[PDB]
Design a protein around this ligand. Structure first.
Ligand code: NA
Length: 125
């Protein structure tokens, strides 16, 4: 499975941003998926996760209530809606996926088989 992020760049504090991730549309598919984010020289920290079907989600504590993760398995996409952006949201955002067999919410890098290249998001006053 390959993954590719879209969205990003310079965004306004207090605004919103939607990131998207394209996943394989062929014979190999993602299971659970997630967004991770990385501050400089830090590890890829979990931000939001979603089960294969989309029925279950989880969020890092500082984004709960502001971020929504969703997916469209018909089109092989996965989205992060990021509201009320904060300076602390500045990071490289990575799309992540488990193998299809692991259908639960992904919350740990140990369970991420497939990574995107990442998209930088810089929240400016
Ligand atoms: Na990529």
């Amino acid at each position: 499975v390959q993954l590719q992020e879209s969205g990003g760049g310079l965004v306004q504090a207090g605004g919103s941003l939607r990131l998207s991730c394209a996943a394989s549309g062929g014979t190999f598919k993602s299971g659970g998926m997630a967004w991770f984010r990385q501050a400089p020289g830090k590890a890829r920290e979990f931000a939001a996760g979603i089960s294969w079907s989309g029925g279950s989600t989880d969020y890092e504590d500082s984004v709960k209530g502001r971020f929504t993760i969703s997916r469209d398995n018909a089109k092989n996409t996965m989205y992060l809606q990021m509201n009320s952006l904060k300076p602390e949201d500045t990071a490289v955002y990575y799309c992540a996926a488990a193998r299809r067999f692991r259908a639960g919410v992904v919350t740990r890098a140990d369970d991420v088989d497939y990574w995107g290249k990442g998209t930088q998001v810089t929240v400016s006053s």
